[PDB]
Design a binder for this molecule. Structure first.
Ligand SMILES: [Zn+2]
Ligand SMILES: [Zn+2]
Length: 217
């Protein structure tokens, strides 16, 4: 199985890329991010594996970066596989109230730090979390990196298909993609969860794909 990939994306923001054979297109590259406030690192989404979380973690730890915490876009393992480990390591793990009710609903270890509402600042003016509303998952959120004008749509931003409809609010995705396409259009880059990093246009295509997605069924 493909090795973890940590590629600087922009200033103080890396794109860790884990791979889990969720039998979709076989092996899938789950793109996450490690926002480096300054001397501190934040795992935006955690690899589906503790191992990779450990690797990603120490990769940054090893380079003098204290890991203040992780933040998950949604409850799936793509974004929570490491909360467990991160928790054993006493890493402040962050997930929405809705994701945790979902993690707890799935008997998965829940992130120790919750938060709710349309928006939550994980870091005053640097790591903004956001509930565009239901979409890929009922709890799915997106993390905006104001400073770099980078958004981590994660699995919400699905520009070429809606992907896993399993836990998706096909009826609410559009509304969400629009509330999203409306709040973060100032975006310089949008970070999907399985596609190359695109620009503010991904917010529109996700919308299109969502309505499109809805039109069918
Ligand atoms: Zn997902
Ligand atoms: Zn996904």
């Amino acid at each position: 199985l493909p090795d973890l990939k940590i590629e600087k994306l922009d200033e103080g923001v890396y794109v860790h890329t884990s791979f889990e054979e969720v039998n979709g297109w076989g092996v899938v590259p789950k793109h996450g991010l490690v926002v480096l406030v300054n001397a501190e690192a934040y795992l935006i989404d955690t690899p589906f594996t503790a191992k990779d979380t450990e690797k990603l973690v120490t990769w940054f730890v090893e380079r003098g970066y204290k890991i203040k915490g992780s933040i998950s876009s949604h409850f799936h393992s793509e974004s929570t596989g490491g909360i467990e480990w991160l928790n054993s390591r006493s890493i402040p793990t962050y997930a929405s109230e809705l994701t945790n009710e979902l993690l707890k609903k799935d008997g998965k270890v829940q992130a120790t730090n919750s938060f709710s509402g349309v928006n939550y600042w994980l870091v005053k003016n640097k790591i903004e979390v956001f509930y565009p509303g239901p979409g890929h998952t009922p709890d799915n959120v997106v993390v905006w990196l104001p400073e770099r004008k980078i958004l981590f749509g994660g699995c919400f931003i699905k520009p070429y298909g809606l992907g896993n409809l399993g836990d998706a609010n096909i009826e609410a995705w559009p509304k969400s993609a629009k509330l999203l396409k409306s709040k973060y259009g100032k975006a310089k880059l949008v970070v999907p969860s399985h596609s190359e990093v695109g620009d503010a246009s991904l917010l529109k295509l996700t919308l299109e794909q969502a309505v499109k997605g809805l039109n069918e069924s």
